[PDB]
């Protein structure tokens, strides 16, 4: 639409697109921060809407906001949560470091929509005010960190943790199914003493189980909310019960264990909970990178690599493309951790103003890890299968089973056999027969890989 | 649109949206890599289109592709470059690590559109073939690194370097304008011997000048193109002149100094040129972070900080919001460098398959630095002004001018004056008068900051 | 000057006055990279690991009492600082730590031989592989030593220093609870809070960091020993893994347990990647606290100047009052180091293959360095800076009362003029005849503005 | 056992058998953080800086010939390794490097006093501040020493080792130019190339890295000396900055110049942030080369096994043929270290304020460590691995000919069956009667497939 609606603030008049619900502050931000393409993610927009919905409810309970306005604001917020207003949030990540401009974006959109819900219009004549009504009892300084933690905790609980549990279950099933398949070990990339494919996969399972615990340990701190600290942490001008009531209301409407932060100065001056929680996510990235690499190396071939397992072929030579997407996003999480650490280390005095960047990286890492585990699970892990003949060919051509001979012929003769096999390019069996130290039936009876794995 | 068009590949039939120009391979990728929200940026899509346009021209020159098909492919590519097909590229960054799927996305879109341009239709009956025609003489393995370098070099030359030069010129103007304004120095955050505001800003200018040289040094390696190496670097099945001809054609159509990579094995197996070029960008980020911090600290106040300069107020208390956006994106560049380094270190054998991730980070850093410099320049740097009275108040209340007394009254008496001023909370002048060591006219004649800056 | 020792590769000259053997000698020839060596914490953890293995092997009837006791006595000498010059190998060695495992095997074997009345070298009465390395692989020994060193350093160095610094700052927060100062957001003047409130944020940060570090300890307490070469424990006694973790717990007084999955324990450094995540969180918190201290102390006349800190370095007689915040500089520098070390650890931890992670010397070098830096940095910052933080009460009150933020206290009773004309709020108000010299003193109470 | 020295803060006991003075003593009391100290390269660069300043001060008539010569002789003793135990200070000190500047001032002053027939301490004939530090500030001395150390280490250590390794790999590439092997993309079998071609990629990587490192040298050659406290050079001779850069260029034989903008030189570590960018590029290239070597050598029976590498460590007699790629492990570990060090450097370089960057000891600690790691790592990898790379020709040909990739050679004349039935291409073809035992040998020529 070309038509505009004129709005005015202390700097003068500014035109806003007539078909949009935002106002003068959003327009000024969008015009002054034309930096790259990254915007607030939907998860954060929704968390801001939840925050305003909870504040409106508490302000009504406390007699500070009328029933008619509070109900209209909550209904507008529910429309945002239902996906009806995604194009009303145009602002860049690369904005004011407190997130003030996105706070005001939500205030303006909810106020103008609430006005319409009460039979009014958008703009200067609206029936609901962005600051006096939608932002009542609030500061950008406590709202934005609250929305950051709401988005982070819900994404961890609802997306990442369920996908981690699902992938863990799949690999545990595979570990049990392949518990009796002996294969060659590899240490330093060199052939080593055997273990079962089930045992090797059980290591991946144990990694994912440990990662789940580390992530779970990070959740209580992310559940602490800044809301009620207002501008500098003192809560100046708020009702004494407001901070607890709004955390309680957020806990009710999200079904997640939000609590008010015990120290609002820590809550405003730092992003420490997210620095710590992201530490657990970069741990998960290091574990997934290792699992993904084992899978693609074990499946390498079809003739000039390892080839011990097969994986689903999802494209019409076929490459381990799910493993590649996963290893790439694991690198991304490691970079994101550095950006988060720099922002988290850079607070000054009463406020950390690196917040849009910190939450952009944090929520990206959660999407990448959650969706990457989901994709790797359904398009790779559920279909891993052993190549039993290839596994046995490698085991039987290795030199590593020679220790099974020690109890029968002694260490010196076993070592002589292995040295001859290596020097002359023979199997252990062929070298042993060539020296006359045993018969083929003896070799087959004594060299039992299933007895060498514990 | 709900209606579909059925296409078939070696895996069977797959439905594609009837209103889209992509084909079966793009559809399979979009369905198997539903990971997060990051997609190929427009710059990379355009670079892929340029690559196909150049290949079509050379294939025609060499008698390998008909005039009618080559001309139609070039016209379709020009439509992409003109912004007519942005919604035809739906694939995630988090795809196959070679970028094969985005290569095929461009092949399918250009083939189907070229078919329409020749009076045909989209789909199985198209008059132009994605592989046999649009991908003729090519592999994903050489196309994708070529598009990466085309996008990177053009973004550096056309966006980042011009914005760097513009910001440098603005700060040089400010340095000259303020060359005679003496202010207090600060080392370790402590008051120190004086320098002019122009001298301090000249440091920022010299930083940006040095950064431009470092960036310029990185351009020749990025200008080397993999195209012609085909699958593993040998160029098997290509015309002997093809590699040089296609680099020449890209140089002509872009007006940039592209050349064929002297070693195609390096060109396919690594992202080394981008690892090195991004090293220069993280240098720029460290310099910009320092400049932005000096600006916001020098402007801090209005009464309880430093307050030596004023900056434009762009929002209706006013915060240094351009400095905050810039410091945040500088942190992002540092994280992006780590992701790039991990991907660049992780090639195996004939191909690096961390490429979508590397180019996603690299092009993001270029957008952030280019657009951030542009925004900081027009919304902050051009309007920096001294607060002359505040500068003089700080200089006159400091203890640091006391050395101007040494030549007149001797070091011992000057040190006694400074010690008394510090202990008793006095100005140097008041302490000197209290001791009877000089008159007020003598102090004003001897303590000349304009004589203490070289 | 030399004796001739032997390994599977042939004869090699070894310094006669050293206790190491052929494999350590060869390592010195092949890994001449930079200057970083195993830190004392890791050497001690390796000695403890060998001491525990010797005891368990004796209990299981696998090693004679005379040899096991001599090995344990030699290990005690290492722990007592008597053999620091016997461990010359670089960090930048085989990625499993094999070379340092053999360094400890050879030193302990040769010293144990002497304790039994024998000599060092080929004729020794105790053997590095057959006796000191019995039941063990480098593959499970090195990760065990890594976790022993890490857990003990966290419990004995880092956590005590963190608690000590937290207590100091808690005392300062209580002492300054009534001192009202100007808030700062975006570096700009903002509404008031007390100095005690601001310091309470630092305290709460350190309290939260302690909890995060404590949550990382159970995983680090899991030990690989008993997994042997690939995790199966092939050729080891079924009770050995549990027994050796129990013995390490006894001799160290720390809650070590055998790792429930030896494949995870051998194939990854995951416990240390996670624990270092908590340490980089502490680094980000300490960076912020140290920056607040140095900015609040900036001056003495052209910065903020709200607090004073101890002056520990001599100055120039002609620049009295220039006090560089040198403890804050050491601390911010080491916090930057911890962030870099985290990246190095993450790359190594992401890079295991199959049955073994072979980035281990580098991972533990970084991890133990971060622990020393954070522990010693917190000790130094506490003793030489934090304990001496004091308010500059006159300066605090000058900034608070000359600011424009207190104007909000006039809302319920009835600024641009003060700002544009360079006046105080009271001077601008009286000039407008909107109140008096008693109403302003009555209505504008900063101590009522921190609730 | 002790002597009593004095600074502006009072009297302090100093070890009688040491050459440092009061300020170094105080630093030892206040900066007891970890174990990292100034590296020898930096101590030497500081001594060279003082040697040059003494000569220029003498030329300008500011320092007596007898004192200047004695200072220069004391500096030469430091450079000759006679005073390594006189520099005890931690990296984790004042962020300008003041403490280490004073350490060198005190050691040189006390030794110069002895050379003039005097004593060390209060009665010394040469003064640390008035004589050894004349015309200087810690603020411009420390960045000068940083750049002197960095440029000389790049020119004398790193670049020669890079050239040596490149030459070795170039020889290998030429020697193996005719050995056709299977390509691998995505870890999967792919069309052929020669072993020489694959190695030529490693060579081209190292050649490109050399150019990038060379491009970083001009900025590192710019010296801060002469900017004094804040960059203005207040109270220094107008020719001093140029003269002292010229003298450093003469005595080091390297192209040092005075920095054209002293404010940039004091307020940033930008030249080192940029130069380290090129070093992390080299680390990413060396990681890839080292990984190719160890994967190509993997086996001896259940990996790739296309090349052999030297066996440098003794093995078990019962595991002949297990050759761990230990040089590749040391090299990949140190490459991970360089990546972490880059982050630490970037944070320090981004963190200057106003006239001075005070993250300097940490920045130079990381930078010089990366140089040692890369230089010594390239030396070790060259001598103990790269020079001995050899093809396993039978294994290379077995993998090449049993693969499915060569089927494309049949296009212009006329695979699924071979793959599904476990046959060679020739066996599957003959079975289908699509060619013979002579046509296949004629049409499928891998040596014609690398053009």
From Swiss-Prot, chains C, D:
Site (Important for catalytic activity): 329
Location(s) in or outside the cell: Cytoplasm
Inducing or repressing factors: Under conditions of iron limitation and oxidative stress.
pH dependence: Optimum pH is 8.
Phenotype upon gene inactivation: Cells lacking this gene show an increase of biofilm formation.
TM helices/strands, residue ranges: none
InterPro entries associated with the record: Fum_hydII (IPR005677), Fumarase/histidase_N (IPR024083), Fumarase_C_C (IPR018951), Fumarate_lyase_CS (IPR020557), Fumarate_lyase_fam (IPR000362), Fumarate_lyase_N (IPR022761), L-Aspartase-like (IPR008948)
Reactions catalysed according to its record: (S)-malate = fumarate + H2O
Temperature note: Thermostable.
GO biological process: fumarate metabolic process; malate metabolic process; response to oxidative stress; tricarboxylic acid cycle
GO molecular function: fumarate hydratase activity; identical protein binding
Keywords, in A-Z order: Allosteric enzyme, Cytoplasm, Lyase, Tricarboxylic acid cycle
Pathway the protein contributes to: Carbohydrate metabolism; tricarboxylic acid cycle; (S)-malate from fumarate: step 1/1
Oligomer and partners: Homotetramer.
Note: There are 2 substrate-binding sites: the catalytic A site, and the non-catalytic B site that may play a role in the transfer of substrate or product between the active site and the solvent. Alternatively, the B site may bind allosteric effectors.
Chain's role: Involved in the TCA cycle. FumC seems to be a backup enzyme for FumA under conditions of iron limitation and oxidative stress. Catalyzes the stereospecific interconversion of fumarate to L-malate.
Protein family (similarity comment): Belongs to the class-II fumarase/aspartase family. Fumarase subfamily.
Name of the protein this chain belongs to: Fumarate hydratase class II
Organism (species): Escherichia coli (strain K12)
Organism classification: Bacteria, Pseudomonadati, Pseudomonadota, Gammaproteobacteria, Enterobacterales
